[PDB]
Structure 1
Amino acid sequence: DIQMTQSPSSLSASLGGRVTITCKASQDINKYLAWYQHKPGKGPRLLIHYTSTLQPGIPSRFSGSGSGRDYSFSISNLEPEDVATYYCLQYDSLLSFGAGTKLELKRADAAPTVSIFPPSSEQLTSGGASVVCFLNNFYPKDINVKWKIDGSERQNGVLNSWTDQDSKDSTYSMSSTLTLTKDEYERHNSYTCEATHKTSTSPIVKSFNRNEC
């Protein structure tokens, strides 16, 4: 009926800098545009209505502007607590949101702390074997995790999971799990995960052998 295309899907920015999100309507919406901030574990917070009127109690660091079809929203002196996802909302005819913008902060590069974990006795008795590898507190977000079994790269059986930006230190973390059957897990000796990240020329390699204990 009326589409809002919100123009950066994601973005990283430094503390003290400025952030701008554009929101573009399919037809003229007569300045009937509101802006929402959405954090994990809360309902959306109304920031601005009628294109640029600050809701009461909203920092003056937040501003909006536009007319006709094209609209802008800005945060001026970025603070750590502006991390969130933001949405525009037209209310000229019916209601619809832009797809949203995920805002995260820049920090100095951090290298990942890598840890590998063998399958437990409990799980082996069950007939399964997971090898878990944590890549914790790194920056920036982009990281690669590679698994090798006896030196051959392995892609099946791998489940990756990744956190959102940590509120305490602005780092990211990621978890990778290679799940085999017990019989297949016993046919091989070495299990290694390699973390490739721009903080290092050579990947961080962590490895397990069923070779003592």
Structure 2
Amino acid sequence: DIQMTQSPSSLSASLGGKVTITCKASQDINKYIAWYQHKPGKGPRLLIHYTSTLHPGIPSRFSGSGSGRDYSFSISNLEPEDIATYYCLQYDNLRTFGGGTKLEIKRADAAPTVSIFPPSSEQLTSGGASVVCFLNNFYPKDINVKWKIDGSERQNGVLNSWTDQDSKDSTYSMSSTLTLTKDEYERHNSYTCEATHKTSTSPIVKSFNRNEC
């Protein structure tokens, strides 16, 4: 039945700025459209119903407009806690959600704080060896991590994971984990993780030496 074409699928805007999301319905939905904010860890929150009606308690910098098949939703005076995914919803005939729009706040670029950790003595008893590198509080999200063993680049056994954007300082963090067997780990002595980010042409390098302790 009724399809809801929500665009763009992602948005990036600066503090104090304004964004607009478009929703296009496949048929006339007679102004029965609603808009929701969804943060990871919470249930959806109603912002606007019947095209433009602000739900009491929602800041008036949230707004909606449109009629027929064409609708829009806007947020002005953007704040860091506006980071979320937003959805339109038609309720003219049963219910259909749009595909969602993920909103990023654009802060000043920031370089990562980088930390490297050897495998724990506890883990080594299992026969496995995870080397962990944290790259914390950077912006933008795009970043490159390079592992070196004895100064030679290593590409297998690496697993990376990014946090969501932080609702308060608008930064990202990421972890990179290199997992080896204990025997391979103990065949080499130098372990390095190198972070390359647009904030500098120079990588940020953190290393340790594996010795007998």
- Give the number of equivalent residue pairs: 213
**Residues 80 and 169, structure 2, Cα contact 8 Å, conserved in 1:** no
- C-alpha displacement of 1:41: 2.9
Per-residue CA distance 1:75-99 (angstroms, 9 max, x = gap):
1211233222111001122211112
SS at match of 2:201: coil
Extract unaligned runs of 5+ from structure 2: none
Partner of 2:2: 2
CA distance in 1 between partners of 2:5 and 2:187 (Å)? 52
CA distance in 2 between partners of 1:99 and 1:148 (Å)? 41
- C-alpha displacement of 1:187: 2.2
CA distance in 2 between partners of 1:108 and 1:37 (Å)? 25
The more displaced of 179-188 and 126-135 is 179-188
Partner of 2:38: 38
What's the Cα RMSD here?
1.6
SS at match of 1:81: helix
What percent identity do the matched residue pairs reach?
Answer: 96
**TM-score, normalisation: structure 2:** 0.93
**TM-score, normalisation: structure 1:** 0.93
Closer, same or farther: CA 82–168 of 1 in aligned 2, 3 Å: closer
Per-residue CA distance 1:88-136 (angstroms, 9 max, x = gap):
0011222111121122212111110101111111111110000000000
CA distance in 2 between partners of 1:200 and 1:108 (Å)? 14
Per-residue CA distance 1:118-163 (angstroms, 9 max, x = gap):
1111111110000000000111111111212233322221111111
- C-alpha displacement of 1:21: 0.8
The more displaced of 125-134 and 178-187 is 178-187
CA distance in 2 between partners of 1:100 and 1:112 (Å)? 29
Closer, same or farther: CA 154–70 of 1 in aligned 2, 3 Å: farther
The more displaced of 156-165 and 112-121 is 156-165
Extract unaligned runs of 5+ from structure 1: none
The more displaced of 120-129 and 65-74 is 65-74
- C-alpha displacement of 1:212: 6.1
CA distance in 1 between partners of 2:140 and 2:72 (Å)? 27
SS at match of 1:122: helix
CA distance in 1 between partners of 2:40 and 2:122 (Å)? 34
Partner of 2:88: 88
Partner of 2:200: 200
**Residues 14 and 107, structure 2, Cα contact 8 Å, conserved in 1:** yes
Closer, same or farther: CA 183–212 of 1 in aligned 2, 3 Å: closer
CA distance in 2 between partners of 1:49 and 1:84 (Å)? 18
- C-alpha displacement of 1:181: 0.7
CA distance in 2 between partners of 1:48 and 1:38 (Å)? 13
